[PDB]
Amino acid sequence: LLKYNVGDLVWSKVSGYPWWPCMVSADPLLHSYTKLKGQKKSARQYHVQFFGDAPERAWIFEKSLVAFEGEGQFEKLCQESAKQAPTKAEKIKLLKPISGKLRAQWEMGIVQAEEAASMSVEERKAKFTFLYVGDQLHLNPQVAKEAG
Ligand X SMILES: Cc1ccc(C(=O)Nc2ccccc2)cc1-c1ncn(C)c1-c1ccc2c(c1)OCC(=O)N2
Q: Which residues contact ligand X by CB under 6 A? A: 14, 17, 20, 50, 52-56, 58, 105, 109
Residue 110's alpha-carbon distances to 28, 29, 35, in angstroms, are 24, 27, 27
CB of 102 to ligand X, least distance (A): 6
CB of 6 to ligand X, least distance (A): 18
d(Cα 43, Cα 37) in Å, to the nearest integer? 5
Closer to ligand X by Cβ: residue 54 or 144: 54
Closer to ligand X by Cβ: residue 96 or 120: 96
CB of 56 to ligand X, least distance (A): 4
Closest residue to ligand X: CB criterion:
52
Do 25 and 31 meet the contact criterion of CB atoms below 8 Å apart? no
d(Cα 47, Cα 95) in Å, to the nearest integer? 27
Closer to ligand X by Cβ: residue 33 or 50: 50
